[PDB]
């Protein structure tokens, strides 16, 4: 049951569709959040320039800084994905 | 208490780190506020740009400046702090 809810986002709609698409893949395949995170983060570096950062978690709050138009916070079912670009 | 599970910072800094996340964890009840605290501190102390995650359940994958990384447990809360940009 992987339904996507984008809570907060500063990216282009096209790029946030990929964030979702890539994260869906990642969730299905891998069992460890760190591995889903690593996958998303690597796919984003390659396809979209370094440097990206990813968090995949069930309980976390974050305070981060990011490049304009390179941020997204969303849910895939019950799990929260933080993806953004800095440096 | 402060079970540092991984660190790339100087010993000093890991302290300044642990201590501040203590202040922050004392003063605040919402993770975002704790993270925000720590994060804004470090920006003001060690220059921008720092990022901070505080959660009980999260996997991460991030890229950091040499000597500006730390992931640790404080009680049952995980605290990832690091510089990049």
């Amino acid at each position: 049951d992987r339904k996507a809810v984008i809570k907060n986002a500063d990216m282009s709609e096209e790029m946030q569709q990929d964030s979702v698409e890539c994260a869906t893949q990642a969730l299905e395949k891998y069992n460890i959040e760190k591995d889903i995170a690593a996958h998303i983060k690597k796919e984003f570096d390659k396809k979209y320039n370094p440097t990206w950062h990813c968090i995949v978690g069930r309980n976390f709050g974050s305070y981060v800084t990011h490049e304009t138009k390179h941020f997204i916070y969303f849910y895939l079912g019950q799990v929260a994905i933080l993806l953004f670009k800095s440096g | 208490k402060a079970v540092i599970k991984n660190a790339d910072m100087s010993e000093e800094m890991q302290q300044d780190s642990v201590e501040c996340a203590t202040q922050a964890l004392e003063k605040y009840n919402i993770e975002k506020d704790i993270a925000a605290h720590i994060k804004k501190e470090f920006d003001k102390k060690y220059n921008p740009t720092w990022h901070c995650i505080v959660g009980r359940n999260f996997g991460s994958y991030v890229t950091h400046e040499t000597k500006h990384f730390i992931y640790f447990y404080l009680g049952q809360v995980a605290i990832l702090l690091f510089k990049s940009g």
Partner: peptide, 10 residues
């Protein structure tokens, strides 16, 4: 422009 801080909470 460039850089914006942002906070999240599950």
């Amino acid at each position: 422009v460039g850089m914006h801080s942002k906070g999240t909470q599950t």
